[PDB]
Nucleic acid binder design. Structure first.
Lengths: 152, 325, 96, 336, 239, 115
RNA sequence: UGUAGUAUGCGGUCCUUGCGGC
């Protein structure tokens, strides 16, 4: 009886604490991350999950169809907006592709494939379930970001 | 809710465009941004290099990302016409012809009004002063700094006391001084900002600004460029000004008119530092003159320094009278 | 959240909820402090026949460290918060 | 010279590219705009999915506007039957209906989050611009607030010195220190008036006898609070959404583009000196052009007189206050 | 039934039912928007018809829909000619390319059932004018449409102190999309009161009164009444 | 009223604890209120949550029939077999309402006697 | 069991020259 809600909460707490600790000095980075987190579900519901991920990648000045989440470093960007976008993309894609971990209750809907490349050549039902999971995890992430992270 | 209305007439064709580049039309947003720039220019004299105070007062007056604008600007009536008009200093590369390039632009005169409304007298006065300074010493739209945006106040109607229009050259001469002193008085009385006085501003401002006048014409149709050939004997006032500017013997610049004290896109094919030289048309007692405004800022552009007094030599080449100071 | 809350992020989650549901930040801080204090002392009815937890709760001690050493901390804290919320609801309905 | 990509699933990107190349005919504007958003890569190595970069796939701005308006016009019959049913719903209640043309450009919903970063309120089924009833109610309430503050500012400030002191203390708490500066300008009066109308409605009982002249009629504070309602009492005037008349969509375009060119953007955001070395960052956004005619309707639940008063207030607000976005620049203004 | 101030006197003579969805408005590439249905939807409609037949002891109407069995893959649909793409046997419903399954009896029977239930006028437009804008999709696809294609409306509160959105003054609301169809059952028995007037003596005198008083009317459902949300056209029908 | 073959594809069997948690927390929790027309808002103290058993739920019951009471019963239902037969015939494919909230379309179930 | 509308109050706003030079 291991509810996925516990995994969602643990992963969201871990990622928000990670960004808080790594960028405790950069208040503007925290504000940008919080704003992007609480605005992402609207973008996903409007234009879809793949469009949202491609929008994040474009804001990262990175090419699409040739970039996965494992090969991006969120801290390797000078701009605060790029920092926050990279962190949000990494967190969302990590939850979608691996979950809280291999040994955890939730291991991610995608086995290990990049969520964008997964969305490119999968059925509508799979991308719908992925969108639902992304909505839930983004809700938890926004909750925790509003909890700890400072507001821009 | 004090409000002011300014009915303005386009002395020269105005190249103001919206999203559709092929269509020219008057935009409230562009005018508001230009008034923001001109208010910065006038307030730089009082605020000097203290950019923080200027930013705070501008956010107080024109609004920022955390407060709605304290002054709202609208364009109410547009008795304007759109036609074709040659570009100020652009020549077509057509074989043999080598004539000008004519874009769609607002026709001369083109009566229209601007309404500025606020809830406080001081901020409305600041906005009105910025707008009148813009109209008198600046242009609007594309190629404003090349005599294509000059506007005269056809009529004014304000419930707040303002500065009267000029009649002669000296009136426009000391209007700079009285506008600056009134702006400083408002800044000191209302917001109590001082910012001391360090040196000349990094941006274009009135700390180091000069105004000159040249030429004299009685017909509006004999001012803007008419001839399609520079060598033609029939040249209007602005055509003669352009011909003198293009002459190598005019100024002492090593590259001539292709120097770097003017706008950045000259030879280097890079940067966007606008030309501190601004050309316009000034009407005084039904007499038209070419007005030249220069903003000799301390730093021309971060990473590039150009000599300043060389441009004054051009003023000596044409013998333009120094209206201010 | 009673069926999902864990010890590590209880304080931050309750802080978020207080800030969201408080007109004043002082009210949210007071609610956070009073909830954190009150939810500590609540007797639990574990599935296993264990009374040491209740003995630790009754006395007032390093009970937090004992739960850190304990292997059923998550169930204990979930039952504690659920019981405290039930007591709060009962008392509020009593008032009104 | 531009590379177009589609982050939608495969076997659908082909149809999206066919729609954007005008090879096929799409009929829903919201569908092509949102669910089939293209990512355009110019010489710069970045797939910017913004209207400024989206328009690069067309010949010019005019072609983009023509394509959008043709897609909008392809559903004219369905929009006509929808508007007929909407008018029938209007007439079902004792609703007063008035038509107003757009004096200037109008844009509602510009702040909505989207891939383009500049959205627009389009009806989901038919893809036509419209004004939500919430926006009309809010603009009417704020016009009433502004009228009350301009007319009865000092009076309400004196009557509610406790409330104005509470608001000043709150502002001091949030807005930096500002211990007692807190200027008693018109904005503070508007804020305390809104606070009275929102959380302190009952204390507004004494003020209810006041009257303010709107247009040609006179409206009481009690009338306004009855119209809009409180946390404990529901409003009595139903504000319906506004939709353009289907007839005008046949001839003149119902959607055009507008540009914002933020020079000195680092000066505004980061703090660099303005100067002129501040190459602009143009951003385009959709907006319904001026002259487009909209139909508004306000219904009553208790008294038709309240409906007439609300109609007059809304007409005055749309004439002066303006609805939509960028109202400080004269956008979203209506004329008789 | 009696008001809240007193309930032991008698019970209500009417019993409304849950407004189960029948057609969902989904955006389409051709046929600007389409009315969508699912096999579970029509199965529940058949169950509702069976319940009506059992209540009225009228088996004749029981088999009206009993001639419609369907089974669709997740990438197949039975759509009208308007929605079908020209030169390509495929349809697009707001996010998905679906191959057009070939079948006519099911859609014809559904149109006939709707016509019998709600007459020849389908809420301001003829019913035959929308028979080519109906799509029957897979169950998961219909669930995804009903969960993700609903209206999401963002609203803010503007404070007069600054003219900007207040601190935490923004919120999102979920709305059923416009032009959607919900069917409900309203069962009626003998009134439970005593000494009834002759005009409402029997159940049919309640049936006709309800039908005449709630035919082609307009009602407000849910919240946001003051801002013009939740307004619905109601049509009452009998078998 | 549905083909049993389609049901086979959507049958799952879970653990005991999982089934208990499902049956405890997957029911329909519906919040209801009462609105007064005088003010148009919810009446004070009128909000409450009611729990409803989900639709499309299969349940089974056992009816134990014994020897009919000796009260000069007709020979048609004289034996136990006859009475169980008549009960099954008269209750097969029936529709009946159980529980409260009958006035709001809650409780209607379909009974299919086991033959 | 019977009677019972998750409803009322809330503006997707605020901030930005279609320019720079021949």
């Amino acid at each position: 009886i291991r509810e996925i809600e516990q995994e969602r909460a643990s992963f969201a707490f871990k990622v928000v604490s990670d960004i808080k600790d790594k960028y405790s000095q950069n208040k503007k980075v925290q504000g940008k991350y919080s704003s992007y987190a609480e605005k992402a579900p609207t973008i996903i519901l409007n234009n879809g999950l793949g469009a949202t991920l491609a929008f994040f990648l474009s804001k990262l000045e990175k090419p699409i169809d040739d970039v996965d989440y494992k090969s991006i470093n969120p801290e390797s960007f000078g701009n605060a907006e790029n920092i926050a976008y990279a962190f949000l993309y990494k967190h969302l894609s990590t939850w979608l592709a691996e979950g809280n971990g291999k040994d955890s209750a939730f291991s991610g809907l995608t086995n290990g494939e990049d969520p964008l490349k997964y969305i490119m050549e999968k059925t509508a039902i799979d991308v719908a379930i992925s969108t639902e999971e992304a909505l839930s995890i983004l809700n938890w992430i926004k909750k925790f970001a509003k909890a700890m992270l400072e507001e821009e | 809710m004090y409000s002011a209305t300014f009915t303005l007439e386009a002395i020269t064709p105005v190249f103001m465009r919206g999203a559709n580049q092929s269509k020219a039309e008057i935009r409230a947003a562009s005018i508001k941004g230009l008034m923001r720039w001109w208010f910065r220019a006038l307030s730089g004299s009082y605020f000097g290099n203290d950019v923080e105070g200027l930013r705070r007062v501008e956010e107080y007056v024109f609004g920022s990302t955390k407060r709605e604008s304290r002054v709202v600007v609208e364009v109410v009536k547009e008795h304007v016409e759109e036609r074709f008009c040659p570009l100020p200093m652009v020549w077509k590369k057509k074989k043999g012809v080598t004539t000008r390039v004519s874009q769609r632009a607002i026709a001369p005169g083109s009566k229209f009004t601007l309404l500025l409304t606020s809830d406080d007298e001081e901020v409305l006065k600041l906005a009105c002063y910025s707008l009148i300074g813009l109209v008198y010493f600046g242009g609007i739209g594309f190629r404003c700094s090349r005599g294509a945006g000059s506007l005269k106040i056809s009529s004014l109607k304000s419930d707040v006391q303002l500065i009267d229009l000029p009649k002669n050259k000296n009136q426009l001469g000391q209007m700079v001084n009285d506008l600056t002193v009134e702006i400083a008085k408002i800044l000191k009385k209302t917001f109590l900002c001082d910012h001391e006085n360090k040196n000349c501003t990094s941006y274009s401002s009135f700390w180091c600004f000069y105004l000159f006048l040249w030429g004299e014409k009685a017909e509006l149709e004999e001012v803007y460029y008419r001839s399609n050939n520079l060598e033609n004997e029939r040249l209007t006032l602005l055509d003669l000004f352009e011909k003198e500017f293009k002459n190598k013997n005019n100024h002492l610049s090593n590259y001539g008119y292709r120097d770097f004290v003017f706008g950045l896109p000259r030879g280097t094919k890079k940067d966007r530092r606008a030309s501190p030289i601004k050309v316009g048309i000034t009407e005084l007692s039904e007499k038209y003159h070419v007005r030249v405004s220069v903003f000799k800022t301390k730093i021309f552009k971060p990473g590039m320094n150009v000599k300043w007094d060389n441009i004054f030599v051009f003023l000596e080449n044409i013998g333009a009278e120094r209206i201010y100071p | 959240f009673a069926d999902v809350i864990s010890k590590e992020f209880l304080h931050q989650l309750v802080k978020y909820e207080a800030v969201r549901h408080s007109i004043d930040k002082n009210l949210a801080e007071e609610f956070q402090s009073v909830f954190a204090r009150g939810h500590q002392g609540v007797r639990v009815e574990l599935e296993g026949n264990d009374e040491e937890i209740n003995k630790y709760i009754s006395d007032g001690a390093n009970l937090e460290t004992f739960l850190d050493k304990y292997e059923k901390a998550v169930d204990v804290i979930r039952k504690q918060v659920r019981g405290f919320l039930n007591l709060v609801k009962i008392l509020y309905e009593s008032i009104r | 010279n531009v590379v177009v990509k589609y982050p939608v699933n495969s076997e659908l990107a082909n149809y999206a590219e066919k729609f954007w190349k005008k090879e096929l005919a799409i009929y829903n504007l919201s569908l092509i705009l949102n669910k089939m958003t293209p990512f355009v890569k110019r010489r710069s190595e970045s797939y910017k999915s913004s209207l400024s970069a989206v328009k690069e796939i067309f010949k010019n701005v005019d072609d983009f506007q023509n394509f959008l308006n043709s897609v909008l016009r392809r559903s004219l019959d369905e929009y006509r039957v929808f508007f007929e049913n909407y008018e029938r719903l209007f007439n079902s209640f004792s609703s007063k209906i008035f038509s107003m043309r757009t004096k200037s450009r109008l844009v509602v919903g510009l702040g909505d989050e989207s891939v383009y970063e500049t959205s627009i309120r389009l009806h989901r089924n038919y893809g036509v611009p419209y004004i939500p009833g919430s926006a009309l109610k809010g603009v009417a309430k704020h016009y009433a607030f502004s009228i009350l503050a301009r007319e009865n500012g000092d009076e309400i400030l004196r009557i509610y010195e406790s409330v104005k002191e509470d608001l000043k203390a709150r502002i001091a708490k949030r807005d930096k220190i500002k211990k007692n500066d807190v200027p008693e300008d018109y904005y503070l009066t508007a804020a305390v008036i809104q606070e009275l109308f929102e959380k302190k409605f009952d204390e507004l009982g004494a003020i209810r006898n006041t009257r303010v002249e709107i247009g040609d009629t006179v409206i009481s504070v009690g009338d306004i609070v009855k119209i809009f309602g409180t946390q404990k009492e529901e409003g009595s005037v139903i504000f319906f959404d506004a939709f353009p008349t289907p007839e005008q969509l046949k001839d003149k375009p119902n959607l055009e583009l507008d540009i914002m060119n933020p020079h000195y953007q680092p000066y505004y955001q980061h703090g660099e000196p303005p100067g002129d070395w501040h190459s602009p960052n143009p951003i385009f956004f959709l907006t319904v052009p001026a002259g487009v005619e909209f139909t508004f309707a306000v219904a009553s639940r208790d008294l038709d007189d309240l409906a007439e008063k609300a109609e007059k207030l809304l007409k005055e607000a749309l004439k002066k206050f303006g609805v939509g976005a960028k109202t400080s620049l004269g956008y979203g203004r209506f004329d008789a | 039934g009696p008001a809240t101030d007193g309930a032991s006197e008698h019970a209500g003579a009417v019993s409304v039912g849950d407004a189960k969805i029948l057609l969902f408005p989904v955006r389409s590439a051709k046929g600007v928007f389409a009315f969508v249905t699912s096999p579970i939807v029509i199965q529940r409609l058949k169950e509702d018809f069976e319940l009506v037949s059992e209540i009225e002891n009228d088996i004749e109407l029981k088999q009206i829909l009993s001639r419609f069995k369907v089974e669709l893959s997740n990438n197949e649909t039975i759509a009208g000619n308007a929605l079908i793409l020209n030169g390509e046997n495929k349809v697009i419903l707001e996010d998905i390319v679906l191959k057009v399954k070939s079948d006519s009896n099911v859609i014809e029977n559904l149109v006939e059932v709707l016509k019998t239930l709600f007459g020849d006028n389908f809420f301001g437009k003829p019913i035959e004018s929308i028979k080519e804008r109906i799509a029957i999709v897979s169950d998961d696809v219909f669930k995804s449409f009903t969960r993700f294609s609903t209206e999401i409306v963002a609203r803010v509160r503007i404070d007069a102190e600054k003219g900007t959105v207040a601190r935490g003054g923004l919120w999102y609301e979920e709305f059923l999309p416009s032009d959607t169809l919900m069917y409900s059952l309203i069962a009626v028995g003998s009134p439970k009161k005593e000494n009834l007037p002759k005009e409402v003596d029997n159940t049919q005198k309640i049936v006709n009164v309800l039908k005449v008083t709630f035919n082609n009317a307009f009602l407000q459902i849910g919240g946001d009444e003051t801002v013009g949300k939740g307004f619905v056209k109601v049509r009452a029908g009998v078998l």
